[PDB]
Amino acid sequence: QGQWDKSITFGVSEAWLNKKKGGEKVNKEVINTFLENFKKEFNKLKNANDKTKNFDDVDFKVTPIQDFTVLLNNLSTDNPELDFGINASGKLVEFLKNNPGIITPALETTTNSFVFDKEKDKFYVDGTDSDPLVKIAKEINKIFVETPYASWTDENHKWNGNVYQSVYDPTVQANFYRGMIWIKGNDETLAKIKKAWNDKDWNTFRNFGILHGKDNSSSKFKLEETILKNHFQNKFTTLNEDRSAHPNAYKQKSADTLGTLDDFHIAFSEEGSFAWTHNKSATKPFETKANEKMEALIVTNPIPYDVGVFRKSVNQLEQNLIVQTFINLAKNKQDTYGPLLGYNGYKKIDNFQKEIVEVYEKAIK
């Protein structure tokens, strides 16, 4: 059933942990009270239960990790110095396809729903104006274009240091997230792009210039690739092959810089990424030339939110207490770390294949 481990180490993003807010390291103070709250609730549950109270009390710590490849690789070695971490779901499903059973997924995060995307079960249909993913994109434009983002204020949109709270409905927890496709130009260019989209003219559409993230990203590459393949039926095989033949039509850069590239007019991003991007930042995110606008074209199919995974030999009883400690901390509003990453709630995973793998595979098909 695995070994009881009296020391539990959470892997966290190195870049996040050393985050200096005025030379200070706030996140480090944030994670220590989280850890202190976690230890006390965990050991309370453990000692309250007859099956686990005779095991040693457990101490919790964190360790900084470079990136998610080191997290998954490190966990798969099943070394007690690193026991648990939370990873994007698509990347994890891809890892476990290669090397099945090597690590153990156990909990699912949830995030406050966007006011414009409260229902999971909207999928691509045909990319026309009655397509449910196009309808969500129109709702996003009402929020981001009609009431222009550049003029939002911290008080207007309830900025809390973390996110713009006015674009969220915390009463509804979303089981999922989506990517989205942005388009940018003056009036004539926007119309030309929508025409190429409606005419399913791939070559013209792609030649407007596509900004994308890394090849292994779900929400900045793969989910969009799926929509494009389904909309422009049989016109290219994969975005990587297409790029190979048309390298100047593609650039790896964040969508919020799209306004600064005169040569590019299409960009991939996570849905609603402006919601956690302060419009007053030095980089001037989402800014565009005077007579140009940036707007949403369509969003993607949905995939699960991030997943917490264990090295394989942590005792099963211990795993379940840790899972329930995350859930109760969030309920008691004692989770000071999660909300900073977008994790506003937690759920136990009862069936990985049904709840995570199948949901992801249907979205990229």
- CA-CA-CA-CA torsion for 180, 185, 191, 197, nearest 10 degrees? -40
Least distance in angstroms from the C-beta of 175 to Cl ion? 26
Of 130, 124, 233, residue with least CA distance to 180? 124
State the minimum distance, in angstroms, from the CB of residue 216 to ligand TPP: 7
**With CB cut-offs between 5 and 8 Å by kind, which of Cl ion, ligand TPP, Ca ion, none does residue 218 bind?**
ligand TPP
The minimum distance between CB 95 and ligand TPP, in angstroms, equals 12
Alpha carbons 214 and 68: distance in angstroms, whole number: 13
Question: Binds 249, which of Ca ion, ligand TPP, Cl ion, none (CB < 5 to 8 A, cut-off by type)?
Answer: none
Closest CB to ligand TPP among residues 49, 162: 162
Taking CB under 6 A as the criterion, the residue among 46, 157, 220, 311 binding ligand TPP is: 220
Between CA 185 and CA 293 the distance in angstroms is 6
Between 189 and 320, CB nearer to Cl ion? 320
d(CA 322, CA 324): 5
Which partner, ligand TPP, Cl ion, Ca ion, none, binds residue 80 by CB below 5 to 8 Å per kind?
Answer: Ca ion
Angle made by CA atoms 252, 363, 356, in degrees to the nearest 5: 105
In this complex, which beta carbon is closest to Cl ion, that of residue 115 or of residue 317? Answer: 317
State the residue number with the nearest CB to ligand TPP. 342
Question: Which of residues 19, 30, 63, 80 is near Ca ion by CB under 5 A?
Answer: 80
Which positions from 37 to 76 touch Ca ion by CB under 5 A, shown as an x/- string? ----------------------------------------
2 in contact with Ca ion (CB under 5 A) = no
Closest CA to 232 of 265, 264, 197: 197
User: What, of Cl ion, ligand TPP, Ca ion, none, does residue 49 touch, CB below 5 to 8 Å by kind?
Assistant: Cl ion
Q: Give DSSP secondary structure letters for 216-232.
A: T-IIIIIHHHHHHHHHS
Query: Which DSSP string do the residues of 116-170 spell out, in sequence order?
Result: TB--S----S-SSTT-HHHHHHHHHHIIIIITTGGG--TTTTTB-SS-BGGGEEE
Q: Which of 261, 251, 267 is nearest to 183 (CA)?
A: 267
Tell me how long the chain is: 365
Q: Work out whether 134 is an interface residue with ligand TPP (CB under 6 A).
A: no
Q: Compare residues 156 and 316 and give the one whose CB is closer to Cl ion.
A: 316
Number of residues that bind ligand TPP (CB under 6 A): 16
- List the one residue from 7, 162, 198, 244 that touches ligand TPP (CB under 6 A): 162
What is the rounded distance in angstroms from the CA atom of residue 71 to the CA atom of residue 81? 12
**Residue of this chain nearest to Ca ion (CB atom):** 80
Who contacts 257 (Cβ-Cβ below 8 Å, separation ≥6)? 211, 283, 285
Q: Give the pair of three-digit tokens for residue 91.
A: 């990347």
Site pattern 73..92 for ligand TPP (x: CB under 6 A): ---------------x-xx-
Looking at 97-105, 190-198, 213-221, 230-238, which segment touches ligand TPP (CB under 6 A)? Answer: 213-221
Is residue 281 near ligand TPP by the rule CB under 6 A? no
Interface with Cl ion, residue 49, by CB under 5 A: yes
CA distance linking residue 15 with residue 235, whole number of Å: 40
Burial 308-319 (b: 16+ CB within 10 A, else e): bbbbeebbebbb
Kindly list the residues in this chain that would bind ligand TPP in the complex (CB under 6 A): 88, 90-91, 162-163, 177, 217-220, 270, 276, 305-306, 341-342
Kindly list the residues in this chain that would bind Ca ion in the complex (CB under 5 A): 5, 7, 80, 83
